[PDB]
Amino acid sequence: RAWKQMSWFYYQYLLVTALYMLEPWERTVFNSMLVSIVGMALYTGYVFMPQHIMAILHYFEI
Amino acid sequence: LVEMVQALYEAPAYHLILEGILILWIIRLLFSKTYKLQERSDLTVKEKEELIEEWQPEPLVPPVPKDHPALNYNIVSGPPSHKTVVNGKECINFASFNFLGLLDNPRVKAAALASLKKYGVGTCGPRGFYGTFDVHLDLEDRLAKFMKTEEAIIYSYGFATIASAIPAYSKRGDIVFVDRAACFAIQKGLQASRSDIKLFKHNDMADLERLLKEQEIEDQKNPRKARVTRRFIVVEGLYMNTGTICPLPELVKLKYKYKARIFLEESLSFGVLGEHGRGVTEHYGINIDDIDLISANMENALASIGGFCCGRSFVIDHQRLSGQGYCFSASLPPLLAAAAIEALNIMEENPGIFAVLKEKCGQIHKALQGISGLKVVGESLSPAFHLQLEESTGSREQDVRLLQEIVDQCMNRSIALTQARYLEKEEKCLPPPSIRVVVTVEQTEEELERAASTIKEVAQAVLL
Amino acid sequence: LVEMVQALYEAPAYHLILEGILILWIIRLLFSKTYKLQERSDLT
Amino acid sequence: MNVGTAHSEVNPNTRVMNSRGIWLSYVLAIGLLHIVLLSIPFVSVPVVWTLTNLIHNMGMYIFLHTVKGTPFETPDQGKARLLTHWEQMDYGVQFTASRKFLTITPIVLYFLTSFYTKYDQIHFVLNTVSLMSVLIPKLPQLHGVRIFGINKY
Amino acid sequence: GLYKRPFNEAFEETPMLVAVLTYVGYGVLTLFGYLRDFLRYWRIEKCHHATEREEQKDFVSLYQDFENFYTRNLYMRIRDNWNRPICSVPGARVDIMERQSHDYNWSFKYTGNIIKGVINMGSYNYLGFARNTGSCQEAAAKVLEEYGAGVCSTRQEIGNLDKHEELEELVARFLGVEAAMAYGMGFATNSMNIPALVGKGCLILSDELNHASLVLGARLSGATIRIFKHNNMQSLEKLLKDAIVYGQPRTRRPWKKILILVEGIYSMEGSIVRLPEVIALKKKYKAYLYLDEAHSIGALGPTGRGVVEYFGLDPEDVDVMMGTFTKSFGASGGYIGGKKELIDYLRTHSHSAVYATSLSPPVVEQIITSMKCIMGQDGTSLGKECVQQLAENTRYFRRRLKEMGFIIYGNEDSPVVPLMLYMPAKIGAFGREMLKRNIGVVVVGFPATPIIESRARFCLSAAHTKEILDTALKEIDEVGDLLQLKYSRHRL
Incomplete structure (x- = not known):
């Protein structure tokens, strides 16, 4: 059930971001750029921004 | 002057910026070319309503005289064929563009009937939306193989073929060198595109050379514009209005000398000229690849409704997405396409019928020579040629009336002739009134001699 | 508010003059109600 | 698709800036660029702020005042084969x-990026040069004019 | 203008988030298109395109590359939706030849197998006359055996026949006008008869959503063309007033004529023209009316007499009535109906009357047989059940689709049903998933339409039974769940 939901959510991401019609290596380029941006943003947020959002996330998880 | 610069540098910033905006104001005033009066007047509502009520529109259609000859249509009581029945009188057909005589070939009817049983009459949609059948692709491939070209495209209406092929490639700001005596289809195609049209004398390469050299000079004036301007030469293989062939080799040499592509119209020469009936290119032996685009219609020789354009994929693939008559109209009915394919098979089977047509055209052209009041206009290889008035009266109406009187007298003598029709107001170069004579492989030699004798006697009697 | 006023007071004068003329340009743009067609026609 | 299948307008391009949601998408694009920077x-x-201003202004100049023509074949026979998007x-x-929105937005961005750079002169010269490079073509006087014949053809 | 019946239409505006996501998708496609163009420019990646021959490299390049941008970058990616060959009569069920591509839609190759029994929602046979076995086909075969296929001369010359006269009389009786004329192409009708009526110095008020034939016909003539908003009677009235009052632009003279071009049913939008308002304004301001009835001549009306029958108006009010036999009657052709003086002037001074071949003989027989069937001259109750069946199918389909939560454009009585997708990738997705479930639809993208509005059009028919409609509705609902195409706020 969970795996099917994840597949459907990936499908919706493809349809929304118009990656559905792009060739596989173009999808690879876009995904690599996106993951690099997200990871670097999280690293910068941890280094400089106070970890108040971290406590909120931990409380939500708990 | 150095002291002035030092003093200005020692001045505060606000003073300098104010002086700068003052200088900008001075420039704006000095460049205020428009002079205004501050006078504004607006119409009163009563005056507007008075103008609305006063205006009276012209009638939609101007009153037509009852003496117009084109108002009377010839009513054929049966299929238009050899030994037809026009106006209730039996006649031999010398007026319909059916050269090869494939209209009544039983094989064509059988193929059309089979495809009618398989598919029906209507296609019900454009080529994009479920309007493409396998017969259309088969016909396109057959045309491509027959003409020794890479690709071909088929339209469902002969006029639309060229009237939509020409505007697709020619845009605003380009140059088109089109023959003077070109059919109305090419004229409307050139009007649809907004390019600049240069007209040269009928079959005069001196005028073509002169116009090309003038354009070369204008290019020397401005290279940047000449880099982005394309040049086309639109000619017809066997002319409709005049009945004379065109000199391809000189056109091809001028193409390679002056960098201008060639568009060929082969409506009349597609199935009558050349050993295998591949058009004027085969008749001259010029290579098929030299001519960019070759257009024709399937209506005259193949005896079915439609048209086509053939060439390399580089030029043809553009029309599928830019041709108006192709993108925004229903596709050809399947039975017409099957009839065209069967006609192509018959043409490819026995290529001697072109020789038969050639010899019959020669016989009739030789026999017709000698009319006192009529002059033959055309060439010995043409299947359709004109008979024009040797001595022209002052007005066109009397010329048309004399020609119509001759035509009626011939019709009462069992020869069916038609007179060439034109839009008087619209045509750029309006040809003289003429009687159109068409030759078919169906007509035997004896009928040709009898027709020559009949038209000869009738012309002698009427003109005297 | 007060902090913005102090920061503006700490700015150079020519900078604030430029910003003022830009604000005037924006006002002129907003109140330029007339939509000029920008076309030229000459009689034949 | 072909131009004119579902709308009679010969040049759809001219209306792409009046559509529903284009302004909000443009503003959100600027915001996302700022977040990334x-x-x-x-x-x-x-x-970061001066980079945002310069990058946004350069992209806007390229897209509005450099690329000329249309990306799709248009049935008015190449009337706008030489006009740029701002003129179209x-x-x-x-x-x-x-046009008012597109002229105003760079000025508001200039005010913000001037304040957040504490009015430094080195940043000031770059920001003013970029803002002028954007705002000069927006003038109605510079309609269909090319200086020294660059980008005419 | 008085409406004897309610006039209901709903054009719901797009959700805001959907618009934002649409622009995201188009921006991504544009950027990757620029990247692909740069890669192909330096020959780093081999291009699968034809190039000019080596002898002509000196010639100025034939095409401008930027014009083909959306052809290479967007159209090629989802090219497999369009140009689908078929090998059967386009009835309720059509057989589609199957093709596959391994070059990402640059080149296509045909697999041996053919898809059979595909529900056909793309064809135009509103009244279901596209049958290979029927009385009409028998009559067409009988005429084809004798007259032959195709006539080889123009109407003014020997190319005129008796069949054409019989068809013209039948059409004149059908519409109710004094006289009518028939042409061999629906496109040619407009393109070659609009220039004859109106020339330079006149005004052609054209709708915002006219077909390409009407626009081309207006452009060929030298008349001035002004465009009013789609079914916005205020805009039409304002343009009429200003045109009459201010006169010609350069020299303030009164216009020679004012002509208003409108259509019966607009295909892609699905709306029906507000005919009573148009007729009232035409009478008030002394203008002339051109009514294109390609879609409404068979679909609309209690007896399929047109849209004037649907609204109850008098046919003598509309000046020129163009129509096409392709959609409803199942045979290719066109016609213009009006008063006798109009028809005589057109017979004398029309481009296709003088320069182009007349209709085929079997096609006119098929038109005659189908039109006689609709008239009731045959005497069989068939042909009157077709209109009722089409009306019932339209009501059922539109109501059921609207109650699922979709967005649908147009009037409640228009057989064409546009369903909105709003995104570029969802165009290709919807087309492919519908074909995978054995339904054929027509999807329309950006350059044709506004940017936010990308749609899929269903053309209902009287040949569609209830089981076919139920199957199509169930599959449409499943695909709508799959792609999340239900963007309707009111219902879901």
């Missing part, structure tokens, strides 16, 4: 809500 760890905030907008009507 702030994301860089070793770059100071004034540099609204069929040449000089003042319109879209």
